[PDB]
Amino acid sequence: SSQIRQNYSTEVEAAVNRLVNLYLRASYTYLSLGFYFDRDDVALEGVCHFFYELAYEKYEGAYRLLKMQNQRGGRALFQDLQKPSQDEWGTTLDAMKAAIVLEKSLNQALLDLHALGSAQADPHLCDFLESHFLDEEVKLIKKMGDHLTNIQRLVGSQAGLGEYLFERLTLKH
Amino acid sequence: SSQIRQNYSTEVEAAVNRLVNLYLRASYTYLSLGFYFDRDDVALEGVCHFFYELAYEKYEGAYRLLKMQNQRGGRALFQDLQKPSQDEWGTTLDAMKAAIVLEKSLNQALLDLHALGSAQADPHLCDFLESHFLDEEVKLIKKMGDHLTNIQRLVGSQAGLGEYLFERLTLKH
Amino acid sequence: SSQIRQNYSTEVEAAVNRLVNLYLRASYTYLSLGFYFDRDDVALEGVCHFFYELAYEKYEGAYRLLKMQNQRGGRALFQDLQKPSQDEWGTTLDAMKAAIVLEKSLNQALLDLHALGSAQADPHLCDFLESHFLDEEVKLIKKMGDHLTNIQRLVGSQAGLGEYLFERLTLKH
Amino acid sequence: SSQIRQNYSTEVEAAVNRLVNLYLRASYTYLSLGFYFDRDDVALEGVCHFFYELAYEKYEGAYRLLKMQNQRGGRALFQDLQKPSQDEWGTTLDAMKAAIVLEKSLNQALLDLHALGSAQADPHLCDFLESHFLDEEVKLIKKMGDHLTNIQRLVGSQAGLGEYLFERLTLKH
Amino acid sequence: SSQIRQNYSTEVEAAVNRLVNLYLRASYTYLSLGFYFDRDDVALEGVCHFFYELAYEKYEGAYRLLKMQNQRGGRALFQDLQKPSQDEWGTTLDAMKAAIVLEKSLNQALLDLHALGSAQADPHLCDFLESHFLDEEVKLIKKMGDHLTNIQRLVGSQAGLGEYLFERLTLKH
Amino acid sequence: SSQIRQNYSTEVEAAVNRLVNLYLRASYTYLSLGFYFDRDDVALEGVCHFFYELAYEKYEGAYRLLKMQNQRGGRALFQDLQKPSQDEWGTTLDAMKAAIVLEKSLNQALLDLHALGSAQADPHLCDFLESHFLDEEVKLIKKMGDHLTNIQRLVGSQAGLGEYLFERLTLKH
Ligand SMILES: [Cl-]
Ligand SMILES: [Cl-]
Ligand SMILES: [Cl-]
Ligand SMILES: [Cl-]
Ligand SMILES: [Cl-]
Ligand SMILES: [Cl-]
């Protein structure tokens, strides 16, 4: 069949197509989070920018997986993309809790694919994930944990004040 | 309900959410077209770049609709995104024929929304489509028609030669 | 014996010396391919430049292995270098088919050495190959597969025309 | 407990805290080596600079481990730091022999932690060590071995002359 | 014994070695304070930077003492370094109270060494401390007192809000 | 047969292919000499650089011969390349004695080919060797003779000292 494929299992090829769907789902989730915080009755610009940047980051992860699929001689296959889990995302705290749950689900999927690649003795796959995904994910989850702690300390007796101050003084606008 | 909404019908709000889904579907279609032409057994770089640029253009149309939805005080609602119509896209000619069918479907959806806005006496909506969508679509469909004519004249007795030459001498690589 | 050697097996040391011989053999093969396409009765400058650049790339892989051998405290040992498999390399298509066979043989040798290093719990060796060899090889084999597809589509009824056009419009001159 | 911790064993967390202590011990050893060669009755500036730079390099390795500990959601724990093994370090040859023994002890600790991470299927840990520690250590031990050979060839009949010349013509002052 | 030593008592030499240990202990304390505020469940970047800068300042004080010891012809002697007094440092207020207690202990040690040097008629020692340590310490303790007053005024009814605001609007991030 | 060949004997064509093998053998010899002096138990950087530069110079002589072979319409033919005469090269003096023996063997081969070209009344060949090879060889052999005299004068009673000093003060590092 393939003129270039070498040491690239059907199991890894399939798992890469599934991981693309997970990253595009995550990208779509962040697009929805961004436009919720852009609503005139929510109006938290720095929160909107935080999640819009993540929509782009997750799309770029999908793009790198698809590029690698073709570099290895697998076939990119696209499936339907489910809509995000919510239409309205609550407070900045609710949204950042949803985001860290989403990132730990992507991180577990990365770790599971790395374990498959290790079992299949596919060092190019293992290095690819180590070099472009695992540390990106650890650093993002650490950032979200930092943000969750600062959001939680600002709730106090005065949730609205804390939510304003976090968006103004931690996030970019 | 909304503090800003003025002269913005529920019919237009719903039709804008549907049009976002159509543009994101089109974006996803172009992502698939791009990665098909990137395959080592297809390998037409200028065709890959043509369709990848359209994936971005259609995403940007979805983004402008969502921005406008919030500017008017409607609620952005995301639905599932169906996968593209094909997994393999045939020749450059097959792909460019699929692309012009897709663009005429987006153009008809734009014209239908403009007619709804005109019936609802919503001049901001009508101007928005006139200023950011209708001419973009006319110019792209003219470009695709130009390309289809040049692809068709190169088929001759020697399809492979013509497909190479079109990618090398008309498309960007 | 060695003042610096640590966690560096005799098996890996020997396999690194063998891999140097394989890369220098490959370099010599590409020098022959380059000078064949430089003949006045072949005269395909872009094909000559493609293979001459690969002679340098394979020499550089041999040089990095030898540097690493000394960094680990092994002893570089040189053996005779067999001449290339052919004196005349046929068409650009014949030559590019020979080149992808040669690159998949180097890639398998890399994967076999990585497996030895993994079995010997030699993470410096494994990372060295992951960081400087495995992706270089995947990217080159993808490029050759792209080129083989474009060469094959240009054969048509008119092999000479296709061979000229590929050298003029894809390769660098 | 931890909001960010994922795939991070208590065994690795503890071993990282121990490795921090080993690197800070090594840093302190190099601070002592540097100030010994700064004595007016020793007075080998290039030897002082060599070991002072290593005090900084080992401190930076401790700092990167502590940063990573927090990125993974482990708890940095500091323990007492033992003083260096000697108060006086003898000749440049004695000092460079002590330094290579110290670096091979750090390298073995790195390899042992990498093996623990591999057993615990912790690819982020394994990649972290591969990317920031293993090659740094191989390159430093090779440099020290080079220096030991040049110091040994200069002993001759005239140790003082050789020790001066090595400091003047190989080390930086 | 020493070719350069002049007017440099054994009492001062010993007291300088003890003061080095006190400054390295203080440096290690500030390294621990810095990494505590870097935890994802503490996450006060400006507090982390404040204490990390002090780890460097205290290390530099140790380095200047060791340099001076050799300039005078004394022998630098290193002893074990005890770990910091706490593993967890509480609130920014708790940490800044611990820091001013630590700085007043270093200041008293400086004053005691100055008194020893004065009793031993060692004007080089006395001037050294006056020129590089006493004013540095007065200025730092004044800064910490300023910070303690601003932290205390922000506790109010809403400790978390005050702790965020102090880190955002007084400390550097 | 050849459309361009004119005044180019089969004897010269064959002798040029043999001379290519001699120059590639010499290049390989210098690669081995370079990596021997890079060993941590040899560690003479300026000696390593001297011989590595000669590996490149001899490769370039082979390349110019092959270019000229095609310019004249002869056929480049590659044969097996024997490994270098030694695996270990002894002292700098031993290595430089081996190198001058190797260069006088290349110089005699150049002179023999020039005599063949003169007998065959092939002035292009004779001028080619005069313009790109004979003086290069005379100048290199003079340089090596200069180096041998300086190495010999430094042996004295203290071989290691002399070998260090020559590498430090004559060769490039
Ligand atoms: Cl769903
Ligand atoms: Cl569908
Ligand atoms: Cl053979
Ligand atoms: Cl101890
Ligand atoms: Cl203690
Ligand atoms: Cl032989």
Curated annotation (Swiss-Prot), chains A, B, C, D, E, F:
N-acetylserine modified-residue sites: S1
Binding site for Fe cation: E53, Y56, E57, E60, Y63
All residue ranges annotated as the Ferritin-like diiron domain in the record: 6-155
InterPro entries with a match to the protein in the record: Ferritin, Ferritin-like, Ferritin-like_diiron, Ferritin-like_SF, Ferritin_CS, Ferritin_DPS_dom
GO molecular function, one term: ferric iron binding
GO biological process annotation, one example: iron ion transport
Renumbered residue ranges of the record's region Catalytic site for iron oxidation: 53-60
Annotated function: Stores iron in a soluble, non-toxic, readily available form. Important for iron homeostasis. Iron is taken up in the ferrous form and deposited as ferric hydroxides after oxidation. Also plays a role in delivery of iron to cells. Mediates iron uptake in capsule cells of the developing kidney. Delivery to lysosomes by the cargo receptor NCOA4 for autophagic degradation and release or iron.
Additional note from the record: In horse spleen the light chain is the major chain.
Family of this protein: Belongs to the ferritin family.
Protein name in the entry: Ferritin light chain
Organism listed in the record: Equus caballus (Horse)
Gene that encodes the chain: FTL
